[PDB]
Design a protein around this ligand. Structure first.
Ligand code: CU
Ligand code: CU
Ligand code: CU
Ligand code: CU
Length: 505
């Protein structure tokens, strides 16, 4: 396999605006097919990238900054990855739309799956309204990320390389003196399978395919043979012996990571999807499912000279291989100090979410289920409803609801709600056989409150097998048409995604 830790970690340049004033920041980003070398020993790989880059440029904004991005499609008319024509029913083969994940965004700038557009906006989906997306950024400082969200194509377009980081900086956070500038580094983790000739491999069908299957066929999960960070296979990063802030983003299709440091050192978590935790948390390891973000500090002060591997213990379609997917990247604490480390790792970070006292307007019970199609394939469904079924999740603007998510399947699903961040209430185990036979919910143990990592604000949440997960969200500040879905992209596309109407009665 490819030799680990021979390429330096790329750090995506920060995108520069086309126009900027005090009142408005204007960006242009064009999707392009380009080639990039993913490892020292590989020929360049054909990829799809924002501004021709993989990952896309990092976008940095201030809280309340009035930002516009004209996202543009300059991609070929034919995909290079296998399209399954049977999963969705004149239309262009290549459709794109950019979703700012975690964005508190007006609905027509949220990147609705059916707001897609082809090259130069020649053809547009039925929910398309505008070329230039509007991000008011009226929300907590946090790690966001942007990715393609096109109907029935998300797993392919994201795998192609259409991902990037987007960081909101709240000037009120500056007083905490967290590691900043060159000591504040995004880590976008993507697993990939790469052919000998350097081309991306993505399966055309399940292994040993039933003759009943179409060709190509969607697969229910994808586990890549190799791990990349910031678009390089198993890279190294030379770090100074001091505190660093890392913005850890799981930008993988299916894979969940369980991260640790091979010397047994700790992370300090300072943030979740929705921003700073109320209190910092010392952690030896953490789970990171697709689309989750961890804002962490690693203190290299006592580790000068050392090589430390960011390791992974979570299997994907099997146990981890010590030689391959057990490795993420390697820190080498060999960079001389550019100046004194004046950064801090404060304990007191932000207001507790529990300080809020909203009235529970509604309690939604939601099940993670599905059916089988005419070809024998699993179709994953939220509430046994298809994406195209009439909307049922219709919270009122400005109100708070509890969502109780029932998972009787054999796997975890990272459930994501657009627009909002939410509080995690608890998880509770239940009798799966009883639920499947009778629809009756009989608990087999007490409710378990969230770990400290989940006591802040979240937007993507692991709903484990045989458990009921309760979350609480206030729906707003905007009304409109949004979505909620599992963020395993192979599930998202067939068909584990539903519309979410936030109404203004
Ligand atoms: Cu997303
Ligand atoms: Cu999202
Ligand atoms: Cu799922
Ligand atoms: Cu989404």
């Amino acid at each position: 396999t490819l030799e680990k830790f021979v390429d330096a970690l790329p750090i995506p340049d920060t995108l520069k605006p086309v126009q900027q004033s005090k009142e408005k920041t204007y960006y242009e980003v064009t999707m392009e097919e380009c080639t990039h070398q993913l490892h020292r020993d590989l020929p360049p790989t054909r990829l799809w990238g924002y501004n021709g880059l993989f990952p896309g440029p990092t976008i940095e904004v201030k809280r309340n900054e009035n930002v516009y991005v004209k996202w543009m499609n300059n991609l070929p008319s034919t995909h290079f990855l296998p399209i399954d024509h049977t999963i969705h029913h004149e239309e262009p083969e290549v459709k794109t739309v950019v979703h700012l994940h975690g964005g508190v965004t007006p609905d027509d700038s949220d990147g609705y799956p059916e707001a897609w557009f082809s090259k130069d906006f020649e053809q547009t989906g039925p929910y398309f309204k505008r070329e230039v997306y509007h991000y008011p950024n009226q929300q907590r400082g946090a790690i966001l990320w942007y990715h393609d969200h096109a109907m029935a194509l998300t797993r392919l377009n994201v795998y192609a390389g259409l991902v990037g980081a987007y960081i909101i900086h709240d000037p009120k956070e500056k007083r905490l003196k967290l590691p900043s500038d060159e000591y504040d580094v995004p880590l976008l983790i993507t697993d990939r399978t790469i052919n000998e000739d350097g081309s991306l491999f993505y399966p055309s069908a399940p292994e040993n395919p039933s003759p009943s299957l179409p060709n190509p066929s969607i697969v229910p999960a994808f586990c890549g043979e190799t791990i990349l960070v910031n678009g390089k296979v198993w890279p190294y990063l030379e770090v100074e012996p001091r505190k660093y802030r890392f913005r850890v983003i799981n930008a993988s299709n299916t894979r969940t990571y369980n991260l640790s440091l091979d010397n047994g050192g700790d992370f300090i978590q300072i943030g979740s999807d929705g921003g700073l935790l109320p209190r910092s948390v010392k952690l030896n390891s953490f789970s990171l499912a697709p689309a989750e973000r961890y804002d962490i500090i690693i203190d290299f002060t006592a580790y000068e000279g050392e090589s430390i591997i960011l390791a992974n213990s979570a299997g994907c379609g099997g146990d981890v291989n010590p030689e391959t997917d057990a490795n993420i990247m390697q820190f080498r604490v060999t960079k001389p100090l550019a100046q004194k480390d004046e950064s801090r790792k404060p304990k007191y970070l932000a207001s507790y979410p529990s300080v809020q006292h909203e009235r529970i307007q509604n309690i939604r019970t939601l099940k993670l289920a599905g059916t089988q199609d005419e070809y024998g394939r699993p179709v994953l469904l939220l509430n046994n409803k298809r994406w195209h079924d009439p909307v049922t999740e219709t919270p009122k603007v400005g109100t708070t609801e509890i969502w109780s998510i029932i998972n009787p399947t054999r796997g975890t699903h990272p459930i994501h709600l657009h627009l909002v961040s939410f509080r995690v209430l608890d998880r509770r185990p239940f009798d799966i056989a009883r639920y499947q036979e009778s629809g009756e919910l009989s608990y087999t143990g007490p409710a378990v409150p969230p770990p400290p990592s989940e006591k802040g604000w979240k937007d993507t949440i692991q709903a484990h097998a045989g458990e009921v997960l309760r979350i609480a969200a206030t729906f707003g500040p905007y009304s409109g048409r949004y979505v909620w879905h599992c963020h395993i992209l192979e599930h998202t596309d067939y068909d584990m995604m539903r519309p979410m109407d936030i109404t203004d009665p």
